[PDB]
Short mmCIF file of C-alpha atoms and ligand atoms in Angstrom, two decimals:
data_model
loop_
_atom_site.label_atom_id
_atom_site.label_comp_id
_atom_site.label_asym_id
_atom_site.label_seq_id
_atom_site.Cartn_x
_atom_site.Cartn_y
_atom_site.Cartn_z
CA UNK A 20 12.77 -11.79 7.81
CA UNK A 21 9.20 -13.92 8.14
CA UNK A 22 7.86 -11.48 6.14
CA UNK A 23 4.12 -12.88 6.32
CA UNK A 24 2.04 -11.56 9.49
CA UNK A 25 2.02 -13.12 11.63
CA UNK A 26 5.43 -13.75 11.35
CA UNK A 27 5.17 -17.27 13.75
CA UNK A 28 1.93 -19.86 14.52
CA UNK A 29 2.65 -22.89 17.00
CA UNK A 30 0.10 -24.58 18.31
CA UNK A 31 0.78 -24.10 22.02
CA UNK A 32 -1.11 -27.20 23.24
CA UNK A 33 -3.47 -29.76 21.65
CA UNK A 34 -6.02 -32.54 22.62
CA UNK A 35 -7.93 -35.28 20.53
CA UNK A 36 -10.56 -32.41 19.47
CA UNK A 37 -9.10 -29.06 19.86
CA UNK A 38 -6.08 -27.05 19.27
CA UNK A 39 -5.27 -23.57 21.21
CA UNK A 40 -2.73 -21.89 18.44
CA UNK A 41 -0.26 -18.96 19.08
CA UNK A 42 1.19 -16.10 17.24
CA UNK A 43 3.71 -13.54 17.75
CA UNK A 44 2.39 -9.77 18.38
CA UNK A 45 2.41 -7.26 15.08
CA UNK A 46 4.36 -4.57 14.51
CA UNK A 47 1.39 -2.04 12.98
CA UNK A 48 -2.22 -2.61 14.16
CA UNK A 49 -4.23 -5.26 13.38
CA UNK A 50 -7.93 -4.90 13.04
CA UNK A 51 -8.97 -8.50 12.93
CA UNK A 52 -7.69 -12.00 11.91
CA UNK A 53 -8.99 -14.61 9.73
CA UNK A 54 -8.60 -17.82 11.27
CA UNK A 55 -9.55 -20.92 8.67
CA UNK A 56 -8.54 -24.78 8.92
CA UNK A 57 -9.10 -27.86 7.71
CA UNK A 58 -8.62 -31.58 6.69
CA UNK A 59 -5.16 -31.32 4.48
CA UNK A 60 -6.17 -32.49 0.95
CA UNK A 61 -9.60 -32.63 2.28
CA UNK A 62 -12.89 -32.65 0.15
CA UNK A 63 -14.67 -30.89 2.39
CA UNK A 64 -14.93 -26.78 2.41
CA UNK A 65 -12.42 -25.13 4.84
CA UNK A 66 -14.05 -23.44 7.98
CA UNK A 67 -13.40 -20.60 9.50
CA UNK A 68 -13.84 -17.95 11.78
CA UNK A 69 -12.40 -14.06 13.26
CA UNK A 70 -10.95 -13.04 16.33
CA UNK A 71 -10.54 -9.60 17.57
CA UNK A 72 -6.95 -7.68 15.98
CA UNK A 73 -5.57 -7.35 20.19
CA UNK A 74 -5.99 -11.30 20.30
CA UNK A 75 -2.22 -13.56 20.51
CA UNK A 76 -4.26 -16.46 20.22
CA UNK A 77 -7.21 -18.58 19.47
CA UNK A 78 -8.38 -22.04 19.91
CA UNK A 79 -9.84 -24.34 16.89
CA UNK A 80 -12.61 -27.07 18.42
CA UNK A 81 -14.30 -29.76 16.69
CA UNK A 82 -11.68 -31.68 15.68
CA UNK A 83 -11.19 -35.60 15.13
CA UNK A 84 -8.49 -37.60 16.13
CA UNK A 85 -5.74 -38.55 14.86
CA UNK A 86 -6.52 -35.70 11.56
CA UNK A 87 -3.99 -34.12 9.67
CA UNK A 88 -4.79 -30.15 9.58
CA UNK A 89 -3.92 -27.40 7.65
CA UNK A 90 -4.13 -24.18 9.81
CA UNK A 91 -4.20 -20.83 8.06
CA UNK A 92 -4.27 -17.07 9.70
CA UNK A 93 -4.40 -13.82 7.97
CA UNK A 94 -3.83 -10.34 9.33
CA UNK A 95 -6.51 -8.07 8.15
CA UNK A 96 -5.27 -4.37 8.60
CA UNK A 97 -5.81 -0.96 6.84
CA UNK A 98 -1.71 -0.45 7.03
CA UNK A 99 -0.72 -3.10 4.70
CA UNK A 100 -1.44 -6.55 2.24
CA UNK A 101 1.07 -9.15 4.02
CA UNK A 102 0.62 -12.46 2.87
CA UNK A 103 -1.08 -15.24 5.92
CA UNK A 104 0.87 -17.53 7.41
CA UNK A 105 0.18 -21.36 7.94
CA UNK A 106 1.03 -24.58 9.67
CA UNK A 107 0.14 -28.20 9.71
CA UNK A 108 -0.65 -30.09 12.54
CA UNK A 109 -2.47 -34.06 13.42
CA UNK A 110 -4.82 -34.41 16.52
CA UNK B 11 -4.99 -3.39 -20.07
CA UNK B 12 -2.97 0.31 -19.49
CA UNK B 13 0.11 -0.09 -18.56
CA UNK B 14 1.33 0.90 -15.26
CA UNK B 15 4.93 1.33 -14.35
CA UNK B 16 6.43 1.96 -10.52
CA UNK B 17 9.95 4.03 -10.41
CA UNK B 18 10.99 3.87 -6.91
CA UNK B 19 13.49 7.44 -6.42
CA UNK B 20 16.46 7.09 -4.15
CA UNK B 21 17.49 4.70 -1.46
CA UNK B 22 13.34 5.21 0.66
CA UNK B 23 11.90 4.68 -2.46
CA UNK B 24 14.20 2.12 -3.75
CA UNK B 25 13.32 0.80 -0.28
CA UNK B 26 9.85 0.52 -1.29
CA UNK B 27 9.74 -0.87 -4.56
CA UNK B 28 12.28 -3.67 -3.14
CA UNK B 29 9.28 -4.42 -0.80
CA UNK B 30 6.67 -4.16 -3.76
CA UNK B 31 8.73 -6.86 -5.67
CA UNK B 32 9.02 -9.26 -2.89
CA UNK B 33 5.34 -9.02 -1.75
CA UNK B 34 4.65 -8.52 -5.42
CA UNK B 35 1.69 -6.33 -7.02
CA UNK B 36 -0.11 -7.93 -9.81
CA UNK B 37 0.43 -6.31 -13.72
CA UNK B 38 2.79 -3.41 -13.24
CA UNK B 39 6.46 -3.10 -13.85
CA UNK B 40 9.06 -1.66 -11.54
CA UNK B 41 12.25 0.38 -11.61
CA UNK B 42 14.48 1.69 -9.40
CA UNK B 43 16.30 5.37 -9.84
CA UNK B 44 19.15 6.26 -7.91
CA UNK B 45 22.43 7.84 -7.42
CA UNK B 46 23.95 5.64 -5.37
CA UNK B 47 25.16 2.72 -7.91
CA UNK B 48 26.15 0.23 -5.06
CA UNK B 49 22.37 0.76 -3.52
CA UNK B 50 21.01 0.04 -7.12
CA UNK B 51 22.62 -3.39 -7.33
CA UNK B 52 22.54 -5.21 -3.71
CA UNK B 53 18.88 -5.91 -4.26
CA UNK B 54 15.53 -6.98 -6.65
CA UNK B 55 14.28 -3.97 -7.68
CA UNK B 56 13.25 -4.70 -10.88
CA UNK B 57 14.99 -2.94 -13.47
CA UNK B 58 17.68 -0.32 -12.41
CA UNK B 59 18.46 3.05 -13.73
CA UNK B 60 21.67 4.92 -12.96
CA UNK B 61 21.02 8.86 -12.82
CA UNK B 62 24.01 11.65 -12.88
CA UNK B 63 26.86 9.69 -13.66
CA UNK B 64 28.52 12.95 -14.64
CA UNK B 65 28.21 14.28 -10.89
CA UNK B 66 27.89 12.02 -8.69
CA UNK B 67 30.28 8.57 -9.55
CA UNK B 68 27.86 6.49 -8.51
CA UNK B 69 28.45 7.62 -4.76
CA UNK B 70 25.61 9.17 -4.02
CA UNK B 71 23.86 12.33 -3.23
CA UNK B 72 25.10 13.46 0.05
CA UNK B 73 22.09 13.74 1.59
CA UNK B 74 21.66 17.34 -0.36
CA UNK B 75 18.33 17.83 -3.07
CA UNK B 76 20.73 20.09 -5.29
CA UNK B 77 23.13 17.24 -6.20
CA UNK B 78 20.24 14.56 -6.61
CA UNK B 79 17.99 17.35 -8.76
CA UNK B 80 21.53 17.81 -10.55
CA UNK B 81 22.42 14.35 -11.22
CA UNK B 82 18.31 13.98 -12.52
CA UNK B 83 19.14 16.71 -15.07
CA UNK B 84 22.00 14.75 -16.89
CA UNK B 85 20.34 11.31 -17.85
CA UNK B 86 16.80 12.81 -18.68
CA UNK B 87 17.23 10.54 -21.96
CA UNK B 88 17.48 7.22 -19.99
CA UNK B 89 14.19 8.18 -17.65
CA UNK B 90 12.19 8.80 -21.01
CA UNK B 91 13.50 5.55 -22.50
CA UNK B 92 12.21 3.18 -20.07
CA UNK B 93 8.98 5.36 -19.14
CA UNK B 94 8.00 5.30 -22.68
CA UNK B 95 5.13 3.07 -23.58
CA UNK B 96 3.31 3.62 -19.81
CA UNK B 97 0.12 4.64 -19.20
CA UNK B 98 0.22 5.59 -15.63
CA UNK B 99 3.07 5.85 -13.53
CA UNK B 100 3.81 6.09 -9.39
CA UNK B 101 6.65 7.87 -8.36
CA UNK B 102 7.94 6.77 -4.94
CA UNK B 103 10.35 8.37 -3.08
CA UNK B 104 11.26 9.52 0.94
CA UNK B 105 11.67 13.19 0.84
CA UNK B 106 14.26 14.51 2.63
CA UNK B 107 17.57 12.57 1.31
CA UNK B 108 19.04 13.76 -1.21
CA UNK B 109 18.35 11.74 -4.19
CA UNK B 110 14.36 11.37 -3.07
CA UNK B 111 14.07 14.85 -2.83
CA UNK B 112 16.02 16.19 -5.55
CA UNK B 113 15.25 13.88 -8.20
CA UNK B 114 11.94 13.20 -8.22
CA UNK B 115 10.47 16.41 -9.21
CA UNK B 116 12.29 15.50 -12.43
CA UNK B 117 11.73 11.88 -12.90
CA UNK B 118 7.99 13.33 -12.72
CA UNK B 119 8.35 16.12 -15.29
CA UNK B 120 9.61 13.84 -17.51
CA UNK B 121 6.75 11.25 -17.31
CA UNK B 122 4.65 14.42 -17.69
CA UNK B 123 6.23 15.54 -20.82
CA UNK B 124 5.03 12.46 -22.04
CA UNK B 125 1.34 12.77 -21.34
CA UNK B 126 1.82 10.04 -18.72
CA UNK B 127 -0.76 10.32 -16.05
CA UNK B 128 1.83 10.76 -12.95
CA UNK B 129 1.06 9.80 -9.60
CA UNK B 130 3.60 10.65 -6.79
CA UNK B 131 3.40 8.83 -3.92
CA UNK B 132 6.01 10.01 -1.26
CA UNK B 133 6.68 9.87 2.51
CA UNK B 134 7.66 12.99 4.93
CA UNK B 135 10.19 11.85 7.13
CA UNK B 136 9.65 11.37 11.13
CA UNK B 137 9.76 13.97 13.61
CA UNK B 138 12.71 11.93 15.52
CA UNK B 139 15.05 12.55 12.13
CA UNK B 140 15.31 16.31 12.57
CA UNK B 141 14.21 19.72 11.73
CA UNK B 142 16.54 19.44 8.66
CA UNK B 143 15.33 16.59 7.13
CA UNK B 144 11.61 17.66 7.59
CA UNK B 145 12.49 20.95 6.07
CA UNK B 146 14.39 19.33 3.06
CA UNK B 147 11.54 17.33 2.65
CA UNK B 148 8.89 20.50 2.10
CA UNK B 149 10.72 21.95 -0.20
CA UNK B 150 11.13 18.98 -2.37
CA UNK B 151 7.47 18.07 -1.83
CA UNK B 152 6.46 21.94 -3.17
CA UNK B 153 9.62 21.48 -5.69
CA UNK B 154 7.40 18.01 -7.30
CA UNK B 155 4.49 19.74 -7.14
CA UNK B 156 4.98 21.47 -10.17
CA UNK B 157 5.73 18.83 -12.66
CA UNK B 158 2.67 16.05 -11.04
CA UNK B 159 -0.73 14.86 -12.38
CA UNK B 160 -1.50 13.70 -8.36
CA UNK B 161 1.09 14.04 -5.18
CA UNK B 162 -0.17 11.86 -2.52
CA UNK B 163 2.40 12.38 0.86
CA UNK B 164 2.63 9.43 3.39
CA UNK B 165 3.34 11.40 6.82
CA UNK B 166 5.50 8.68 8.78
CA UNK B 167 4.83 10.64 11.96
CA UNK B 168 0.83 10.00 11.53
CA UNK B 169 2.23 6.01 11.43
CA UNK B 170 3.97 6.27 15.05
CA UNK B 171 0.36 6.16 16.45
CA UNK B 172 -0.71 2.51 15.26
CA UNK B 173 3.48 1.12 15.87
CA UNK B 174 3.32 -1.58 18.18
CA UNK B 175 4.21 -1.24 21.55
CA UNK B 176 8.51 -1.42 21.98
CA UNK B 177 9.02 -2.02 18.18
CA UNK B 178 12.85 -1.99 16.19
CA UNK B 179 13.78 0.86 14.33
CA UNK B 180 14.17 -1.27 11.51
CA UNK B 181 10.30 -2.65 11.69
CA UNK B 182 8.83 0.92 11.93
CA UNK B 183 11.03 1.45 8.70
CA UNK B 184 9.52 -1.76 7.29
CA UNK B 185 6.02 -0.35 8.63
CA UNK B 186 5.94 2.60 6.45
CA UNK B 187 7.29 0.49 3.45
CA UNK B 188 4.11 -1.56 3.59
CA UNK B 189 2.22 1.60 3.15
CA UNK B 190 3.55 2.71 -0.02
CA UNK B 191 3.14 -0.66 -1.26
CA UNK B 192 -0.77 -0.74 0.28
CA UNK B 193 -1.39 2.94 -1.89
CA UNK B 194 0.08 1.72 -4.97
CA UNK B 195 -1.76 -1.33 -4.88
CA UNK B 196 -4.87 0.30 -4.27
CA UNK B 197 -5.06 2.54 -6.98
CA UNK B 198 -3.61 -0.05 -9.62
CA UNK B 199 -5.79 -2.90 -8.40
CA UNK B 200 -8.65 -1.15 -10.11
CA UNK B 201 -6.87 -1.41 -13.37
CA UNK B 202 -5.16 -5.09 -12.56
CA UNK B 203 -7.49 -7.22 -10.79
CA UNK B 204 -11.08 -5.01 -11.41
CA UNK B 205 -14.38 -6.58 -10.33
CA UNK B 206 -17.76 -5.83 -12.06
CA UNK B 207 -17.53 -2.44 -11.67
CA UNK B 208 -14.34 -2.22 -13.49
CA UNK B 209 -13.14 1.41 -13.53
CA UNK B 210 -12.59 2.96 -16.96
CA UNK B 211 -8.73 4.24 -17.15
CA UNK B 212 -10.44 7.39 -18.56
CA UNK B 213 -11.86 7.79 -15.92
CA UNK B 214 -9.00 7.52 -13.14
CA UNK B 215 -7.79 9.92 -15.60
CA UNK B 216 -10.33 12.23 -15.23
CA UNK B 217 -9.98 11.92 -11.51
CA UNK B 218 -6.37 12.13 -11.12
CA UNK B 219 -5.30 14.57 -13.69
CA UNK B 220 -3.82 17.71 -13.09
CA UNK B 221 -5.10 17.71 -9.67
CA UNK B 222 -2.47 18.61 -7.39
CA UNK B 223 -2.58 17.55 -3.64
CA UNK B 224 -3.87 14.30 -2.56
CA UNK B 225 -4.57 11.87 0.57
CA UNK B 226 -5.91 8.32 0.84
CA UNK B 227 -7.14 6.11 3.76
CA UNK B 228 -8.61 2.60 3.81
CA UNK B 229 -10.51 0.36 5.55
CA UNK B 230 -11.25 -3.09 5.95
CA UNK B 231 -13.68 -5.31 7.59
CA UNK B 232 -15.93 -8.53 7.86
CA UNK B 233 -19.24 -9.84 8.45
CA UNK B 234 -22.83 -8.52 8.07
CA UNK B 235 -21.79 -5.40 8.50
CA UNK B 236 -18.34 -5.16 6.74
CA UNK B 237 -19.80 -2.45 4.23
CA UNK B 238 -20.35 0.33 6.12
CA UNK B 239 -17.77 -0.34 8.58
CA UNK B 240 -14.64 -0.56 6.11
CA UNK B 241 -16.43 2.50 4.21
CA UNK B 242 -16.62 4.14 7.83
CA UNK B 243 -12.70 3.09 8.70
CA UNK B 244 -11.30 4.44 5.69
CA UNK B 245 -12.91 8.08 6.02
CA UNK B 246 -12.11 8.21 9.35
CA UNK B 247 -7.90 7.30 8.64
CA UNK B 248 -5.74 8.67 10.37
CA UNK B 249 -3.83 9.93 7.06
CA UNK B 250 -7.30 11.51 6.05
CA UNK B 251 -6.92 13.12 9.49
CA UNK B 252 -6.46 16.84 8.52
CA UNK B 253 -8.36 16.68 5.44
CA UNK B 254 -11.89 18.28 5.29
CA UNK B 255 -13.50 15.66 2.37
CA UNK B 256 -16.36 17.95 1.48
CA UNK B 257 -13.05 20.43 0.07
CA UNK B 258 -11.29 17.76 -2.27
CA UNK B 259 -11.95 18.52 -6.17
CA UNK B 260 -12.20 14.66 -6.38
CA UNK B 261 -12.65 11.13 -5.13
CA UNK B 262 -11.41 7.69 -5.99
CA UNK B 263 -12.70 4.78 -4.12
CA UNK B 264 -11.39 1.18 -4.57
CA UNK B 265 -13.67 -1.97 -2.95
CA UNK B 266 -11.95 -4.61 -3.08
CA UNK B 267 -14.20 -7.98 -2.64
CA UNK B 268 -14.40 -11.41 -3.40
CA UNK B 269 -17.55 -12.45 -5.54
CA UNK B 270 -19.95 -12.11 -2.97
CA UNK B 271 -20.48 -8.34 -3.25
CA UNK B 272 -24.33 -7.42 -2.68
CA UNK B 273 -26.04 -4.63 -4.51
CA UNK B 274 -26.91 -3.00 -0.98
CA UNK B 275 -23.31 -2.74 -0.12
CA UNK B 276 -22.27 -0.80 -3.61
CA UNK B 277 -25.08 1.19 -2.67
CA UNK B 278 -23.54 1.87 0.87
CA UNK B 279 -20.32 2.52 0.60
CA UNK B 280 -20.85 5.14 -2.34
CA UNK B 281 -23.78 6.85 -0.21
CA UNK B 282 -21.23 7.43 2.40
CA UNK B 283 -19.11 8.90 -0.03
CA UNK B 284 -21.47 10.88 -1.75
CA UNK B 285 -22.70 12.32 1.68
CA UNK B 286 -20.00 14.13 2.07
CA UNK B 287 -18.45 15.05 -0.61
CA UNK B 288 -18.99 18.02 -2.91
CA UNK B 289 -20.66 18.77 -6.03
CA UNK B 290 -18.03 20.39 -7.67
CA UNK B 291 -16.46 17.04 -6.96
CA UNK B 292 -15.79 14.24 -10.03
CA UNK B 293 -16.22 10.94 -7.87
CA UNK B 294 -14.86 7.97 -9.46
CA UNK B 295 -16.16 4.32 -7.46
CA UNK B 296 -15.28 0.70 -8.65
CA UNK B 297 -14.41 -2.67 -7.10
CA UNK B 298 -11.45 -4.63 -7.69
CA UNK B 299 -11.71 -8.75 -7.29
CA UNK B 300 -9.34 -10.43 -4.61
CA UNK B 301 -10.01 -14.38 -4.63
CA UNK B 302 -8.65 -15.54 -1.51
CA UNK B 303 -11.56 -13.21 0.45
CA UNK B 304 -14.85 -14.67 1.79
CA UNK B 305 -17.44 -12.48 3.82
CA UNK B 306 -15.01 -9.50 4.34
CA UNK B 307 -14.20 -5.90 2.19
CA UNK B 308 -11.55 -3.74 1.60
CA UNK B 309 -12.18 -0.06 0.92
CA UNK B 310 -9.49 2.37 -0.47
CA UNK B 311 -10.18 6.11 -0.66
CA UNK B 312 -8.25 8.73 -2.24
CA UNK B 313 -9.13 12.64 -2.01
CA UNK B 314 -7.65 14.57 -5.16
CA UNK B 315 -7.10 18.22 -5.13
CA UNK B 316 -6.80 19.32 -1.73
CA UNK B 317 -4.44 21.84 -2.50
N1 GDP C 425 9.77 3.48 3.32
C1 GDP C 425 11.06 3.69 3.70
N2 GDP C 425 11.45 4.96 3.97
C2 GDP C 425 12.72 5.23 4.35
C3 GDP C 425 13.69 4.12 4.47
N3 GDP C 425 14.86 4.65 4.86
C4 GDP C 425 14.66 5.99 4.97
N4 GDP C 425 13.39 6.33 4.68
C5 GDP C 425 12.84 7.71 4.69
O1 GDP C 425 13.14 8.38 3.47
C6 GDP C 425 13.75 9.64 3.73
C7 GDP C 425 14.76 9.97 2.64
O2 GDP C 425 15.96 9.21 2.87
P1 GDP C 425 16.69 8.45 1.62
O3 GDP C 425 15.68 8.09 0.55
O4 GDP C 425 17.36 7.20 2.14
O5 GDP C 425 17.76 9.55 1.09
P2 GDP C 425 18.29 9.45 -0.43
O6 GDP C 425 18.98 8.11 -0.62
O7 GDP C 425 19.27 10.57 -0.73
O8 GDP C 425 17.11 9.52 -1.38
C8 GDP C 425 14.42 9.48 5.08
O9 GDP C 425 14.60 10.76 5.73
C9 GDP C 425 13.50 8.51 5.80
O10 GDP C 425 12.45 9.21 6.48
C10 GDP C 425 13.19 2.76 4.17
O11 GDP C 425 13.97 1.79 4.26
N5 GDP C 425 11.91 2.63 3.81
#
């Protein structure tokens, strides 16, 4: 019913600089995913970054404390165009 | 600018187009055909269109091509109404039902008689739903042939290979959904969303018209490199798998890029293209703009004219 893929991102554990996220595995093959994040309502440009299409997870470093982020991954795949799904999270 | 409609055909292709509205494609407007007048209404499918009223009392097909070609034949007044006006339009459908298979071929004689440029894009059904179904679906498939400007088939058994490991029924129905919706959106993002090399309609004309058989693949990747890689991905498709390229009568490629798109990389992916194919061959090659992209590519090949 999620409808994006992935269809579910929770950051599985976090500390003052660094979050390791999670996501469910895909139904059709995934080449790669686009991983970006960044201060919510932030000036500053987004960053971002890939990880392999057989990855679950990833981890986001170079955080600050006590930082509200906006954490966005996209499924990059030859079988379809789903949407990305994201999530919010403060160090 | 031209106007592209989407007529999903029967309960797989109303399926689809379900899917297309949800996930939405940008600038064309759907419809849904069917028998089946219960199917027609649980859903958003756009704008609905009862066929063989006569027939069929809006119960269906019965899984049989005759009754779903018969019910076409009744109504081929209200498929010319709303298809009037379109420039282009993609017929999708499941062959091997009843309404799919049977009405189709009509819907897409119909948009023909119109001088509509008619793109059928339709499934064959898995090898786990029977020798009947599979045969159903052949005949309909040779049946549409004769009344189609382009008939691109989806093979769901080629899709079995990249199904996740242990997945539903259900999500490896969803699965080849997403690929109907994937080829319709890249052919009409070159018309909806082009880039600087925006592709003349004339031109997809002159590339799809009167063709006959087609296939399409795609790519996609990112980084230094994501040129010749996506290029190299889409060729290499395993729905392009049992098509020689250097025999299609034409080519259509769609890269789709955000603005970062480097004169090298035009230059690459069309010298791929070119390598292979033939010079009998009209070969069509534009880009289409997605925003929300940075550093990666899409590329979308279709082969015309196998046949
Ligand atoms: N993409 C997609 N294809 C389907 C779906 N359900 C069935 N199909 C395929 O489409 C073929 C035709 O079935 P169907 O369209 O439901 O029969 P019809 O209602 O008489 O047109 C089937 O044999 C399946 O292989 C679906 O939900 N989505």
């Amino acid at each position: 019913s999620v409808s994006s893929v992935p269809t579910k991102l929770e950051v599985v554990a976090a500390t003052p600089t660094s979050l390791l996220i999670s996501w469910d595995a895909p139904a059709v093959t995934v080449s790669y995913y686009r991983i970006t994040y960044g201060e919510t309502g932030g000036n500053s440009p987004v960053q971002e970054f890939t990880v392999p299409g057989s990855k679950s997870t990833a981890t986001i470093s170079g955080l600050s404390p006590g930082v509200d982020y906006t954490i966005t991954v996209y499924a990059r795949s030859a079988y379809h165009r789903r949407s990305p799904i994201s999530i919010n999270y403060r160090t | 600018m031209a106007v592209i409609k989407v007529i999903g055909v029967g309960g797989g292709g109303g399926n689809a187009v379900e899917h297309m509205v949800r996930e939405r494609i940008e600038g064309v407007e759907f419809f849904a055909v069917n028998t089946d007048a219960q199917a027609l209404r649980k859903t958003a499918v756009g704008q609905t269109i009862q066929i063989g009223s006569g027939i069929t009392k809006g119960l269906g097909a019965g899984a049989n091509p005759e009754v779903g070609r018969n019910a076409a034949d009744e109504d081929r007044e209200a498929l010319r109404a709303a298809l009037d006006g379109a420039d282009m339009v993609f017929i999708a459908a499941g062959m091997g039902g009843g309404t799919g298979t049977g009405a189709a071929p009509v819907v897409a004689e119909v948009a023909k008689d119109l001088g509509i440029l008619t793109v059928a894009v339709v499934t064959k059904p898995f090898n786990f739903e029977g020798k009947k179904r599979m045969a159903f679906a052949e005949q309909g498939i040779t049946e549409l042939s004769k009344h189609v400007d382009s008939l691109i088939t989806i093979p769901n058994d080629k899709l079995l290979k990249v199904l996740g490991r242990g997945i539903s029924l259900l999500d490896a129905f969803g699965a080849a959904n997403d690929v109907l919706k994937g080829a319709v959106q890249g052919i009409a993002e070159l018309i909806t969303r082009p880039g600087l090399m925006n592709v003349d309609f004339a031109d997809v004309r002159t590339v799809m018209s009167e063709m006959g058989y087609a296939m399409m693949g795609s790519g996609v990747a990112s980084g230094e490199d994501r040129a010749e890689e996506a290029a190299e991905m889409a060729i290499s498709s395993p729905l392009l798998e049992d098509i020689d390229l250097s025999g299609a009568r034409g080519v259509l490629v769609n890269i789709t890029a955000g603005f970062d798109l480097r004169l090298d990389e035009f230059e690459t992916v069309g010298n791929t293209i070119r390598a292979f194919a033939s010079d009998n061959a009209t070969v069509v090659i534009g880009t289409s703009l997605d925003p929300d992209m940075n550093d990666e590519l899409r590329v979308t090949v279709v082969a015309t004219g196998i046949g």
